[PDB]
Ligand binder design. Structure first.
Ligand SMILES: *[C@H](O)[C@H](C[C@@H]1CCNC1=O)NC(=O)[C@H](Cc1ccccc1)NC(=O)OCC(C)C
Length: 181
């Protein structure tokens, strides 16, 4: 087995979780410790289904940019026994683009799904379903629903959380390492 398959499979193994909320199925990225991240619109409550059990959520923090605008990411802190593997190092310090990116989706309905989204490029601003959102990025792939949360990865870097699509294009909320400190 080669480099990027091993990395993307290691994430599937250790960090990417199948979850469910009143809104439906999403892919959760567990980043370190008891800290996970989901799309904002996933609308996590006081509890969240994580694969085989309902997990208590202690804290939920919806992220806004300096101008108080939506980033589309919620940092959830979980009442879970054991720490997530630390992958903060894999996350760039500032939002980065990539070439030949891979969308990693893990969901009850689409488990361990690998989607070749291609080059990822700055989009900057997206409006989805009425909410104005910053620090987004774009890939030219027809991304379907139930693929939100999916993890954008290139070459051992973890660069976005999927949040949107128009049927010809996908957009993710880019990841910054400061978010998870
Ligand atoms: C999340 O599951 C879903 C995935 C979309 C649907 C088809 N392809 C995709 O990539 N995303 C959405 O439904 C978002 C909802 C949203 C996003 C940000 C803030 C609030 C709500 N909306 C969406 O894709 O709207 C269509 C736009 C005109 C591009």
């Amino acid at each position: 087995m080669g480099p990027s398959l091993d990395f993307a499979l290691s994430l599937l193994r250790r960090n990417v979780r199948q979850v469910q909320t009143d809104q439906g199925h999403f892919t959760m990225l567990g980043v370190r410790d008891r800290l996970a991240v989901l799309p904002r619109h996933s609308q996590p409550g006081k509890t969240i289904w994580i694969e085989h059990k309902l997990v208590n959520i202690l804290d939920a923090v919806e992220l806004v940019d300096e101008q108080g605008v939506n980033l589309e990411l919620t940092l959830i802190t979980l009442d879970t026994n054991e720490k997530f593997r630390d992958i903060t190092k894999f996350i760039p310090e500032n939002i980065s683009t990539a070439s030949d990116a891979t969308l990693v989706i893990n969901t009850e309905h689409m488990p361990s799904m690998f989607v070749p989204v291609g080059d990822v490029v700055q989009y900057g601003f997206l409006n989805l379903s009425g909410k104005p959102t910053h620090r987004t990025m774009m890939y030219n792939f027809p991304t379907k629903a139930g693929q939100c949360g999916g993890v954008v990865t290139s070459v051992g870097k973890v660069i976005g959380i999927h949040i949107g699509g128009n049927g010809r294009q996908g957009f993710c909320a880019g990841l910054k390492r400061s978010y998870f400190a």
